[PDB]
Every structure is written in C-alpha cells, then in structure tokens.
Design an enzyme around this catalytic site. Structure first.
Site, PDB file in Angstrom:
ATOM      1  N   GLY A 168       3.966   8.167 -28.147  1.00  0.00           N
ATOM      2  CA  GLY A 168       4.097   6.962 -27.332  1.00  0.00           C
ATOM      3  C   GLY A 168       5.420   6.765 -26.621  1.00  0.00           C
ATOM      4  O   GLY A 168       6.195   7.708 -26.454  1.00  0.00           O
ATOM      5  N   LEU A 174      13.722   2.533 -24.226  1.00  0.00           N
ATOM      6  CA  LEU A 174      14.659   3.013 -25.246  1.00  0.00           C
ATOM      7  C   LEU A 174      14.492   4.500 -25.561  1.00  0.00           C
ATOM      8  O   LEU A 174      15.430   5.125 -26.056  1.00  0.00           O
ATOM      9  CB  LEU A 174      14.573   2.166 -26.531  1.00  0.00           C
ATOM     10  CG  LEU A 174      14.749   0.661 -26.402  1.00  0.00           C
ATOM     11  CD1 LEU A 174      14.380  -0.019 -27.682  1.00  0.00           C
ATOM     12  CD2 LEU A 174      16.159   0.294 -26.037  1.00  0.00           C
ATOM     13  N   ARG A 229      15.749  10.454 -38.776  1.00  0.00           N
ATOM     14  CA  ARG A 229      15.253  10.012 -37.473  1.00  0.00           C
ATOM     15  C   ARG A 229      14.359   8.750 -37.554  1.00  0.00           C
ATOM     16  O   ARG A 229      14.198   8.068 -36.544  1.00  0.00           O
ATOM     17  CB  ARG A 229      14.505  11.159 -36.767  1.00  0.00           C
ATOM     18  CG  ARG A 229      13.167  11.511 -37.399  1.00  0.00           C
ATOM     19  CD  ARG A 229      12.369  12.553 -36.637  1.00  0.00           C
ATOM     20  NE  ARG A 229      11.170  12.909 -37.394  1.00  0.00           N
ATOM     21  CZ  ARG A 229      11.136  13.816 -38.367  1.00  0.00           C
ATOM     22  NH1 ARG A 229      12.227  14.510 -38.677  1.00  0.00           N
ATOM     23  NH2 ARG A 229      10.006  14.051 -39.024  1.00  0.00           N
ATOM     24  N   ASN A 230      13.749   8.480 -38.729  1.00  0.00           N
ATOM     25  CA  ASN A 230      12.844   7.355 -38.960  1.00  0.00           C
ATOM     26  C   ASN A 230      13.509   6.271 -39.806  1.00  0.00           C
ATOM     27  O   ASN A 230      12.845   5.456 -40.451  1.00  0.00           O
ATOM     28  CB  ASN A 230      11.539   7.852 -39.598  1.00  0.00           C
ATOM     29  CG  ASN A 230      10.661   8.668 -38.686  1.00  0.00           C
ATOM     30  OD1 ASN A 230      10.574   8.449 -37.470  1.00  0.00           O
ATOM     31  ND2 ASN A 230       9.953   9.604 -39.269  1.00  0.00           N
ATOM     32  N   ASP A 270       6.387  10.245 -43.859  1.00  0.00           N
ATOM     33  CA  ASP A 270       7.233  10.716 -42.754  1.00  0.00           C
ATOM     34  C   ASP A 270       8.686  10.263 -42.925  1.00  0.00           C
ATOM     35  O   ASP A 270       9.284   9.702 -41.991  1.00  0.00           O
ATOM     36  CB  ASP A 270       6.668  10.315 -41.373  1.00  0.00           C
ATOM     37  CG  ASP A 270       7.164  11.167 -40.206  1.00  0.00           C
ATOM     38  OD1 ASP A 270       7.830  12.213 -40.460  1.00  0.00           O
ATOM     39  OD2 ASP A 270       6.893  10.794 -39.039  1.00  0.00           O
ATOM     40  N   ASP A 326       9.131   3.416 -39.549  1.00  0.00           N
ATOM     41  CA  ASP A 326       7.978   4.228 -39.123  1.00  0.00           C
ATOM     42  C   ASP A 326       6.812   4.134 -40.099  1.00  0.00           C
ATOM     43  O   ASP A 326       5.739   3.684 -39.706  1.00  0.00           O
ATOM     44  CB  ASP A 326       8.336   5.693 -38.810  1.00  0.00           C
ATOM     45  CG  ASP A 326       7.354   6.336 -37.852  1.00  0.00           C
ATOM     46  OD1 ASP A 326       6.256   6.735 -38.304  1.00  0.00           O
ATOM     47  OD2 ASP A 326       7.667   6.404 -36.640  1.00  0.00           O
TER      48      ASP A 326
HETATM   49  C1  LIG Z   1      18.140   0.276 -29.696  1.00  0.00           C
HETATM   50  C2  LIG Z   1      17.475   1.591 -29.943  1.00  0.00           C
HETATM   51  N1  LIG Z   1      17.990   2.695 -29.428  1.00  0.00           N
HETATM   52  N2  LIG Z   1      17.195   3.726 -29.874  1.00  0.00           N
HETATM   53  C3  LIG Z   1      17.555   5.092 -29.495  1.00  0.00           C
HETATM   54  C4  LIG Z   1      18.767   5.607 -30.248  1.00  0.00           C
HETATM   55  O1  LIG Z   1      18.577   5.554 -31.648  1.00  0.00           O
HETATM   56  C5  LIG Z   1      16.168   3.300 -30.657  1.00  0.00           C
HETATM   57  C6  LIG Z   1      16.286   1.913 -30.734  1.00  0.00           C
HETATM   58  C7  LIG Z   1      15.401   0.951 -31.457  1.00  0.00           C
HETATM   59  C8  LIG Z   1      15.854  -0.291 -31.887  1.00  0.00           C
HETATM   60  N3  LIG Z   1      15.132  -1.076 -32.697  1.00  0.00           N
HETATM   61  C9  LIG Z   1      13.915  -0.661 -33.120  1.00  0.00           C
HETATM   62  N4  LIG Z   1      13.260  -1.433 -33.990  1.00  0.00           N
HETATM   63  C10 LIG Z   1      13.444   0.602 -32.615  1.00  0.00           C
HETATM   64  N5  LIG Z   1      14.171   1.359 -31.807  1.00  0.00           N
HETATM   65  O2  LIG Z   1      12.215   1.007 -33.011  1.00  0.00           O
HETATM   66  C11 LIG Z   1      11.647   2.243 -32.578  1.00  0.00           C
HETATM   67  C12 LIG Z   1      10.139   2.098 -32.598  1.00  0.00           C
HETATM   68  C13 LIG Z   1      12.161   3.432 -33.436  1.00  0.00           C
HETATM   69  C14 LIG Z   1      12.702   4.566 -32.811  1.00  0.00           C
HETATM   70  C15 LIG Z   1      13.174   5.641 -33.571  1.00  0.00           C
HETATM   71  C16 LIG Z   1      13.136   5.600 -34.954  1.00  0.00           C
HETATM   72  C17 LIG Z   1      12.610   4.491 -35.566  1.00  0.00           C
HETATM   73  F1  LIG Z   1      12.614   4.427 -36.918  1.00  0.00           F
HETATM   74  C18 LIG Z   1      12.124   3.449 -34.834  1.00  0.00           C
HETATM   75 CL1  LIG Z   1      11.443   2.139 -35.720  1.00  0.00          CL
HETATM   76  C19 LIG Z   1      12.741   4.680 -31.313  1.00  0.00           C
HETATM   77  O3  LIG Z   1      11.716   4.978 -30.736  1.00  0.00           O
HETATM   78  N6  LIG Z   1      13.909   4.491 -30.670  1.00  0.00           N
HETATM   79  C20 LIG Z   1      13.947   4.616 -29.217  1.00  0.00           C
HETATM   80  C21 LIG Z   1      15.175   4.215 -31.338  1.00  0.00           C
END
Ligand SMILES: Cc1nn(CCO)c2c1-c1cnc(N)c(n1)O[C@H](C)c1c(ccc(F)c1Cl)C(=O)N(C)C2
Length: 270
Positions: A28, A22, A149-150, A145, A163
């Site tokens: 990480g 993703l 973005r979070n 944080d 986050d």
């Molecule tokens: C479906 C998808 N597409 N995208 C890219 C476009 O937004 C993302 C997700 C996604 C979905 N569900 C989640 N729980 C999740 N990520 O959790 C990540 C750990 C996460 C981030 C970013 C910010 C953030 F708050 C968290 Cl919790 C992340 O790394 N992403 C790659 C975001």
C-alpha cells in the site's frame, strides 16, 4: 449487542483528510492525515492497503483483527485509531513524528548528520520492544512480522511495536515457521532476537550475501547471525537464546524484559 465493537473501530471517510505521502510499499501507500474527531482535529497516519478484499471471510477477518488491535493499550504498543474502506481497506494510526526505528538507526551512521547512539539508548530500545511483546504475549497475540522496520518511535523517543503482521520478511521468521508455517509466541521471540541484532548493528541487513531462498538451508546448516565486534557478550547471549532450535529452550518475553532491564540499570543514564 454484537456489532457494538464495529461502531468503535469504524471511521468515517468524510472526517479523514489526506496530506503529504510518508512512503510507498508493495502492500500500500501511507499519508500524513487529519482526522475530524468531532470538536477536535487529530494528526494521524493513514495506511491504505493496495491489496483489496475479495471475499466476505477476508472482510470478516480484517474487521475482527482491527477490533483486537484497537483493544491494545500499552505505552510500547501502537494504538490503532480506526478503520475505513476506499473494497480496499484503510487503517488509521496515531502520527509518530520520529518515524520508524530502522530508518532512525540507519540514518544515525549513513546520514548527512551522523551521531553515535550510546549502548544504553540501544538497550532501552530493545527493552521497549520486549515490554510491548510481553503485553501482546499475555493478551495471547502473535505478531508474525516483528522487525525494527515495524517499530515506531513515540515523542519521548520510546519505541512501540506496530504493524502486527496485518498484511498476512523471511530473514526474521523462525526456523520452524519457515519449515511448517506454524507461528507461536516462541517464533516471535526468534524475530525479536533478529531485531536486537538489527539494533546492535544499527540497522544492518541480517545475513549479508544470503538470499531469502537460501535462508532456510543456511539456518538448517547451523548458521546464525554473527556477533558484532562492538556488541557485548551478554547482549549477544540474549540474542542467541532467541534463536535456539528447540522453541521451548528460547526465553519468554517477560524473561527478556527482565535481563534487558537489569543490564540497563548497570549502564550510564538516560
Ligand atoms: C512520520 C513518518 N515517517 N515515516 C517514514 C520514516 O520512518 C513513517 C512515518 C509514520 C508515522 N506515524 C505512523 N503511525 C506511521 N508512519 O505509520 C505507518 C503505517 C508505518 C510505517 C512504517 C512502519 C510502521 F510500523 C508503521 Cl506503523 C510507514 O509506512 N511509514 C511511512 C513510516
């Protein structure tokens, strides 16, 4: 008696199946995943932290925070599913198909399909963060944080804070936190003011042309984020209150939720 909480927070690495990536970071990598929830399979997000644990106290702190995050039960707060170890820590979260809030706001204008988001939708996104932050504040939790973005988008296009500064940037941190490395719920209010501006501007970079190393002096010289031309005086007054020099002059997350909800009912639905 003691580790009954470790029983819940832990996730078996042989029940987790990794799929497509993703996104990549400095802290990480995140993948689309399948969790064998015994009889059922769950679509999850799998964050493996690139930074491995080097001490027992670091492993102790991670597992304590994890138990704190799994205790979060609110529609506007991310519910941590569990933790693994690849020792490099892993974090299992629910799969949010609409992705992060910043990417959504940013693609709304700078995408191939540019749709203009109505002021009511934007004010509801802000209201959603303040609700989740009001919850965390009552549970005596400091995010550290907070940023668009979070912030994740639920299936109902509802926002939920995520986050929780577990990987512990500068442009969201309160002036006192840059200066003394002290973090309170009043410094989380500052970060929220920056997030409201991030939502109002539809994903613009805070302080354009200012470098992170210049930020403390820029803020210290009295400078704050300038009011967007398209943004309402009242909404900008709420932002400004969050960036008050004296933390005690800043509003509470319960106060912000109310003012945001009040302006939301006055605006057209839905
Ligand atoms: C479906 C998808 N597409 N995208 C890219 C476009 O937004 C993302 C997700 C996604 C979905 N569900 C989640 N729980 C999740 N990520 O959790 C990540 C750990 C996460 C981030 C970013 C910010 C953030 F708050 C968290 Cl919790 C992340 O790394 N992403 C790659 C975001």
């Amino acid at each position: 008696e003691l580790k009954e909480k470790l029983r819940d927070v832990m996730v078996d690495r042989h029940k987790v199946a990794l799929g497509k990536t993703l996104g990549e970071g400095e802290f990480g990598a995140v993948m689309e995943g399948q969790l064998n929830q015994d009889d059922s399979i769950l679509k999850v997000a799998v964050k493996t932290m690139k930074i491995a644990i080097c001490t027992r106290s670091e492993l102790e702190d991670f597992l304590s925070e994890a138990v704190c995050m799994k205790e979060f039960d609110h529609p506007n707060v991310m519910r941590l599913i569990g933790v693994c170890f690849q020792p490099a820590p892993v974090v299992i979260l629910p799969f949010m198909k609409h992705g992060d809030l910043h990417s959504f706001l940013l693609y709304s204008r700078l995408g191939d399909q540019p749709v203009y988001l109505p002021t009511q939708m934007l004010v509801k996104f802000m209201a959603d963060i303040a609700s989740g932050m009001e919850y965390l504040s009552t549970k005596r939790f400091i995010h550290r944080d907070l940023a668009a973005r979070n912030c994740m988008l639920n299936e109902n296009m509802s926002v939920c804070v995520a986050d929780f500064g577990l990987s512990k940037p500068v442009k969201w941190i309160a002036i006192e936190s840059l200066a003394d490395r002290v973090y309170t719920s009043k410094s989380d209010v500052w970060s929220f003011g920056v997030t409201m501006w991030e939502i109002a501007t539809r994903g613009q970079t805070p302080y354009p042309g200012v470098e992170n190393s210049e930020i403390y002096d820029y803020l210290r010289q009295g400078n704050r984020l300038k009011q967007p031309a398209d943004c309402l005086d009242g909404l900008y007054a709420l932002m400004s209150r969050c960036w008050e020099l004296n933390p005690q002059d800043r509003p509470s997350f319960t106060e912000l939720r109310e003012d945001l909800e009040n302006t939301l009912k006055a605006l057209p639905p839905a």
